[PDB]
Amino acid sequence: EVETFAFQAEIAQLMSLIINTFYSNKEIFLRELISNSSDALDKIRYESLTDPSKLDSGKELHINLIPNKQDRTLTIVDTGIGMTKADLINNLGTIAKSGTKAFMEALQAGADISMIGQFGVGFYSAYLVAEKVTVITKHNDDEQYAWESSAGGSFTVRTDTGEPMGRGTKVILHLKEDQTEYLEERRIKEIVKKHSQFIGYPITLFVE
Ligand SMILES: Oc1ccc(-c2ccnn2-c2ccccc2Cl)c(O)c1
Known part of the structure; x- marks a missing residue:
C-alpha cells in the first residue's frame, strides 16, 4: 500500500526552482541535512530531560554519513526525534508553504540558494544533487515510514517493512550521475570541515 x-x-515551485536554477555551489546540501539532523537530536535531547523514557529506543545521539558507490547513494542517518506519518506528510514537520514565500522573495532581493536554511526549507537543497530522495523515519509515538519523491510535484508515503531504526531519520540521496563527487571520502570530509565543524553531536563518515 503506497499513498x-x-x-x-x-x-x-521551490523544488523546480532548485532543480532548474544553474547554481554551482551544490555542496550546501550537506550542511542543510546535518543541521536538520542536529535540530532533530536537540528535540529528542530536550524531551528526554523532563521524561527519560524518550531514550528507550536508543541512547546514542549521533549523525552517520554513509556513501555507497555501488548504489550511487549518500545516506545521512540521525538518531533524532523522528517523524510520525502526520509530521512526515505535513511539509515534513515544517511551515514550508510560508517559508518558501520568504525564500523566493529573498532570491529576487539579491540573496542566493545557499541561504535556504534561514527560511526553514533547507531539506529541499537535497534536490541540488539528488535525482530522488528517500526518507525513512521512526518517532516514539508512531511506526516506521518511508517518504519518497523524484520531485515532479508528488511524493509517496508507505510503512517501511525494512530494517527497524529504533528512532530517528535516514535521508537516502539517490545522486545524479554528474554528482558522484559527494561519494568520495576527501570530498565529504572537506564539506563537513568547512560547513559543519561546530555541530554538537558526533559525525561519523563511514568508509567503503
Ligand atoms: O534531513 C532531515 C530532514 C528532516 C529531519 C527531521 C526529523 C524530525 N524533524 N525533522 C525536520 C524536518 C524539517 C526541518 C527540520 C527538521 Cl529537524 C531530519 O532529522 C533530517
Whole structure:
C-alpha cells in the first residue's frame, strides 16, 4: 500500500526552482541535512530531560554519513526525534508553504540558494544533487515510514517493512550521475570541515 500526494503549490515551485536554477555551489546540501539532523537530536535531547523514557529506543545521539558507490547513494542517518506519518506528510514537520514565500522573495532581493536554511526549507537543497530522495523515519509515538519523491510535484508515503531504526531519520540521496563527487571520502570530509565543524553531536563518515 503506497499513498501518493501532491506537494503544496509553493513547495512544488521551490523544488523546480532548485532543480532548474544553474547554481554551482551544490555542496550546501550537506550542511542543510546535518543541521536538520542536529535540530532533530536537540528535540529528542530536550524531551528526554523532563521524561527519560524518550531514550528507550536508543541512547546514542549521533549523525552517520554513509556513501555507497555501488548504489550511487549518500545516506545521512540521525538518531533524532523522528517523524510520525502526520509530521512526515505535513511539509515534513515544517511551515514550508510560508517559508518558501520568504525564500523566493529573498532570491529576487539579491540573496542566493545557499541561504535556504534561514527560511526553514533547507531539506529541499537535497534536490541540488539528488535525482530522488528517500526518507525513512521512526518517532516514539508512531511506526516506521518511508517518504519518497523524484520531485515532479508528488511524493509517496508507505510503512517501511525494512530494517527497524529504533528512532530517528535516514535521508537516502539517490545522486545524479554528474554528482558522484559527494561519494568520495576527501570530498565529504572537506564539506563537513568547512560547513559543519561546530555541530554538537558526533559525525561519523563511514568508509567503503
Ligand atoms: O534531513 C532531515 C530532514 C528532516 C529531519 C527531521 C526529523 C524530525 N524533524 N525533522 C525536520 C524536518 C524539517 C526541518 C527540520 C527538521 Cl529537524 C531530519 O532529522 C533530517
